[PDB]
Ligand binder design. Sequence first.
Ligand code: HEM
Ligand SMILES: OC[C@H]1O[C@@](CO)(O[C@H]2O[C@H](CO)[C@@H](O)[C@H](O)[C@H]2O)[C@@H](O)[C@@H]1O
Length: 210
Amino acid sequence: TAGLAVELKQSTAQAHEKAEHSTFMSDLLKGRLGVAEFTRLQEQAWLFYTALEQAVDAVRASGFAESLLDPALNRAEVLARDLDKLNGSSEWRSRITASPAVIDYVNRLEEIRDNVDGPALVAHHYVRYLGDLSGGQVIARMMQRHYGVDPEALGFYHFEGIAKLKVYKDEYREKLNNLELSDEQREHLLKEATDAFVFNHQVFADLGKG
Ligand code: HEM
Ligand SMILES: OC[C@H]1O[C@@](CO)(O[C@H]2O[C@H](CO)[C@@H](O)[C@H](O)[C@H]2O)[C@@H](O)[C@@H]1O
């Protein structure tokens, strides 16, 4: 009854807590791991952002949720520049491979792309980008504080082109609230958002294993 933004936040609250408290991310943010582990995270993130942004491009071109799907949010290119700095060269592009979690995640994003599934893509968009614009700011700060990571290797978290972020988020939620969705599309979107958080928790679990 309070609009889609609120329903998404409430709907995914428990899944958010599970991802945030994963052993890998918990250890990362409290200073127990290192830049190597952060780097492995960001390499997996490059694979799934690449897939997410192909799906965004498809859905944006279809005409669905256009104002929400702001190209300033695109991360794949800044992320690759971060990885170039973290790894010291371009070597990582041909070394990295998708964890099992990331294979499932990418596969689903590729399904959304080729189906041009607007509702599903909005879900995935919200789970990643609003998180980047939220908890990601804390992540960036702790990578600097605990591990001495150069801010220039955290371009992913900076969102060049965006100034006031709370305002940006507020407007993001207004756009969510204003999307024209049938009951079936809204239900599909909410279920997808839970799956997005599920994939993201498993990315952390698989990083935790090796
Ligand atoms: C893959 C992991 C994560 C995902 C997908 C994610 C996603 C999200 C999303 C979608 C929101 C916006 C909720 C809304 O307003 O509707 C959010 C907010 C937030 N996240 Fe996360 N998050 C993740 C990890 C974390 C981490 C590890 C922390 C640790 C501090 C964290 C802290 C927060 C906080 C405090 C907010 C509220 C807004 C803010 O403080 O800026 N998140 N997150
Ligand atoms: O606020 C982020 C996100 O966390 C959740 C649980 O996923 O709420 C918890 O954290 C809040 C502070 O950030 C507390 O206020 C709240 O009471 C606690 O459950 C989500 O509800 C929220 O979207």
